[PDB]
Amino acid sequence: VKKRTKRFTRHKCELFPQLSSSWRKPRGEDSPVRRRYKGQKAMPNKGYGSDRKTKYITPSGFKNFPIHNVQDLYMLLMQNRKYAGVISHTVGAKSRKAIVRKAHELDVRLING
Amino acid sequence: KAIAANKAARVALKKAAYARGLRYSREYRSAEKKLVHLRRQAKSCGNYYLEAKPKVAVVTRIRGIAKVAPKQRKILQLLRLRQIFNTVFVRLNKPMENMLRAVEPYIAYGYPSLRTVRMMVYKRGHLKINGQRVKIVNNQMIESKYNNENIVCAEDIVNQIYTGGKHFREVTNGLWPFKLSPPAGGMRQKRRHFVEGGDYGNRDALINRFLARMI
Amino acid sequence: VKPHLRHYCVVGRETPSEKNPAPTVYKFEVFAPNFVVAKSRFWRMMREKNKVKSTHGDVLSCKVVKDRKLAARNYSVDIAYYSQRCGYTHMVKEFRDVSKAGAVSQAYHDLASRHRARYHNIEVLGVKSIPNHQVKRLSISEYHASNLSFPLLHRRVKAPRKDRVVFVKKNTKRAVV
Amino acid sequence: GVDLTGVQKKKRVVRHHTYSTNPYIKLLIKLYKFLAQRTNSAFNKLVHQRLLKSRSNRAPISLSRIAVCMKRKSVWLEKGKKAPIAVIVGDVLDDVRMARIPALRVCALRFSKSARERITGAGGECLTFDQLAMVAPTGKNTFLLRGRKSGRESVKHFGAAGVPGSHAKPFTSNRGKERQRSSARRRAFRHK
Amino acid sequence: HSHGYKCGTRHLFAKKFRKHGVPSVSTILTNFKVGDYVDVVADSAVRAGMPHKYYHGRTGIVWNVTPRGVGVIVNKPVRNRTVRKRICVRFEHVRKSRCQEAFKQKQKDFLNGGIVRAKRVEVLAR
Amino acid sequence: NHTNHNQSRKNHRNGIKRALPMYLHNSKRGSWLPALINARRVRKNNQKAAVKARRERLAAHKA
RNA sequence: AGUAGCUGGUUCACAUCGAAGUUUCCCUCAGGAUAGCUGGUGCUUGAAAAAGUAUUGUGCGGUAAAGCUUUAAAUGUGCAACUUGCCAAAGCAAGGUAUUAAGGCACCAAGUGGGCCUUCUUCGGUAAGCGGAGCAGGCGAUGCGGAAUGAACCGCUUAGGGAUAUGUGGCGUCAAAACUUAUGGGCUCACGAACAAUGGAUGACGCUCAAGCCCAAUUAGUGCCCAUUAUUCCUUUGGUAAGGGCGAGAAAGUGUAGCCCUUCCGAUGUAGAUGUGGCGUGGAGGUAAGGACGAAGCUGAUGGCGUGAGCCUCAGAUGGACCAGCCUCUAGUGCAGAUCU
RNA sequence: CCAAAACCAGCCUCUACUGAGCAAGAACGAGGUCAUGGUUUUGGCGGAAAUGGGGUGCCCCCACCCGUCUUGAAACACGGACCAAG
Ligand SMILES: [Mg+2]
Ligand SMILES: [Mg+2]
Ligand SMILES: [Mg+2]
Ligand SMILES: [Mg+2]
Ligand SMILES: [Mg+2]
Ligand SMILES: [Mg+2]
Ligand SMILES: [Mg+2]
Ligand SMILES: [Mg+2]
């Protein structure tokens, strides 16, 4: 159960198409956001850190671990209830056939099988 | 071996805490019956009784930490009144009565009742331990803090911070200053003196009411 | 409501010394909200009169004083007070009340309105019960007659709170709120 | 909502981990971190913290200065008491000015090839902190020492020179450049 | 705009009323071993060796006795530090301290409330 | 402009450091010299008897 | 590519701390240097030389008041807790056998060096939202809650949240709360509710046995509402904090997806300083791996992860051939703003 | 998965003196609560359901354009149309 589910967006990203939504800390004395007036956007801080034993845990309940080939699956053989292999985006559909019928045989989870 | 010697101690300590607080209960019931006889003697004698002066005030910081002057700001630190509704028991030396007089607008205080002392020490009581602020929970906790054959019970503490103690400093200093909640039902005016219809300053025995809503 | 001001009699003295080995004790009637203020007003007069001060004295008795009874009676309160507009008006107003405490607190509200006079500007100078006739003041004299009857005219009778209502049917007391 | 005035000023700055990249310091901190925690000994707590210091603050010691400080220590020892091990958390350097030294048993992070040979020419052992832990797991008659750092030429520069009390060394590639007439100079001495 | 050595000493170095005149023999026969506490209370009748002004009334220990002068170490708050000053002073300007006379008396000696039966008791009313 | 505002605040940040203890920089030097010179003659003799004392303690410790 | 003490700009995040507008000096006054303030690094050891506070003892003072230029406050302020000279001489001298709180020291370095307001005290000025100082506190650099509104007033100062309770301020509507409470007192008929000209301001309405004023109150002679505050709970982060431990895990560990658990205290922040098994970019030494079963790139109500910079996955009914990871090296490395090109 | 109830713990709320009063102390009893901990129980839902995210709208509420030099910027002060590459 996350502290904040919203992104901490950059101030006024919505007005300027070029600005990425990605966070930049506001600066300028007069910044409404760094002066942290109440009606303004929030800034990220240590206090929004997620609970630390639920951290990094995907709703499946697994921590994702990158996988590239069939050998990686054995890195997850003994901790298959803790880690879930997420096959890399660029492995071929060829190789993924091999990772997948083997990630099945081993009882290891895969996020994108 | 030690495993059970921890029992011989934990059993011996409540045997002591029983023995202690049996004395303190008697030392209260007796001390006050004796203090009723005299004021009652005197009324028969057509005669007044100068009650012994308070030897302990339960000072309570009552204004917040903003805009406070360097002299008041130091006295509050030496009282260990560093937050708002912090509380400490300070005994009423002239030198203290002159510290309290220097920061009264920042504090409410008076002369705690034995009951007020119990509630703070039992409910809000926290020992300093290895610099840790440690909630009182065991008499074991107290005897370890106070390496003092005198101070073993939580009843030892309440007597010290009420009777005025020979260890009133040894005791009250080993307590973290009390972190009371704001008085339920509110204050009156943290700006005026109590006799002005406000809050700050000495309010004598009445502090027990004010401080009761807080504890 | 019950009186604003409790009736304290604070007794105290300058604390004993080789300067004054057997100091006078001073009784002092006060009308205070509570003893801590009565004790305070008592030390106000100790320095304003006896030159003794709170640090150097010691109240011997803060005790409140018991009411004379409860029968309606008649009080001559003698009340000095202060203002920039008036620096010390001696003033024996009379009040009709059940108690010295009630006549006095009644004299503070009266005095606070006709004179923007705070509690600590005022000082009571005495509160005799008076017999019917001695009251020169004409206002309370109306109430002396053993045969006095008056109407409770043009009442606003608010309902008991449990029964109060925002909307009611007009010639009824059906609630509609 | 708290007075904090004067709290931050009381914060101390201490090393809690070595900046040394050297693997052996880290096996050596691994030891005495353990040994300092698991023993009641104050010696392990000193060897462990000194071991965390800068090589600046781990000044080298002359073997000359060990032989002095050691015999000066050991000469008083009651007969049949073998002399303390001479531990230093730093390098031990040979001293030409003391050709012959006592059979010392020095223990240090590092030894000069000269110190190590003179140390063994006297028949003394030149043991490391590894077997220091294995022979004196506690600082039992170890004689922990430090090398000097006041005579270090960096500190000769501390302060100003121009300020009257001072005998700071001015920074100068040119020794003759800031030379000055006796008249024009800062007063040498000055009371604090 | 004009702070010479004795700026603003119109009152400070004034002799007290009907207490004018150079220091007496009790002054002259006082003697100062080093480490003695002293009071640098400047006396105007004596002008040689007069303390600056800041040092007037300051206490400090003697660190030095020359034939007519008493060196005194007197702390001065300069800024964030108390610099420890060394004023030189003619002995007239140094009144020996009693600042420790209580404490010396101590190691010399190291070597509630009840019924008040009082009967007079006027009423306090105005 | 010459306001002294924020100065005692800025000064009490690191406190008014209290003055050095008398046992430290207790140099004489500019002390009335004739006393100062006799003091050297004694201190130098304290040194010869301090060293002579330690020579005694060792010879005593050879037993 | 003249120079510019001037103007403008100077690109990731987070965490840790965090100012100064004053001193001396300068052809100095829009700038330096200097010291202070601040950071970092330590060092040193742990009621060391602790203290913006009292008490007690001992000095200092000449302002207010007084007085007719003299007595004298309060607030303050200091302080304390054998050998070798002198003497006439061996005796003197000198050196030797209350509360609270971790103390001190060093190094390097920044920013700053326009301040402003207010409190009280003043000085100058006829007066000022005026010039100048002293004191302290603030704003600057800081919100939040309140005063309708307000840089500095009031309260309170600040990690992400919940309960509780408050502070200043309120409780007729607006607006949470007296569904217009009092089983309180007076006063009031026309206005009334801290710091001459666009029509229009107790904030608005409206209120008048008040919804005004003074006073007191809290269910009544038998209270309630609202804070970034307090307390408590959960979580985070920091601690160069305190301990314990060493079905899957149990690493001797600064720092990671932290070796694990426990407890405690802290958390704002401009300039600035620092940290970061912090993010991210082009390249290199390595390692490991991927790709025509589709690399990079690009698109994306593709979700997922991370406080965040960001990463990852999904989907392209995109592309067409390169390339991510990890440790080390490197730099022409991160952009809404320069009247930028 | 949504619910609801229970239990335990926690937590919270709700005589004495005096001359009818207080400056006054507990007790019994009961309630509340999981955005407190541990104990399940019981039902509801189950090509879909369910929780989460995302999108769009609304509602109530909060909310002065940013950068800038400046004591002070929302300023009737300067710079600012958009985007890409730099
Ligand atoms: Mg209030
Ligand atoms: Mg105020
Ligand atoms: Mg040297
Ligand atoms: Mg004078
Ligand atoms: Mg200037
Ligand atoms: Mg901070
Ligand atoms: Mg400029
Ligand atoms: Mg005068």
Ligand SMILES: [Mg+2]
């Ligand atoms: Mg005058």
Ligand SMILES: [Mg+2]
């Ligand atoms: Mg507001």
Ligand SMILES: [Mg+2]
């Ligand atoms: Mg409402």
Ligand SMILES: [Mg+2]
């Ligand atoms: Mg911060």
Ligand SMILES: [Mg+2]
């Ligand atoms: Mg390049």
Ligand SMILES: [Mg+2]
């Ligand atoms: Mg879109």
Ligand SMILES: [Mg+2]
């Ligand atoms: Mg570039």
Ligand SMILES: [Mg+2]
């Ligand atoms: Mg301007």
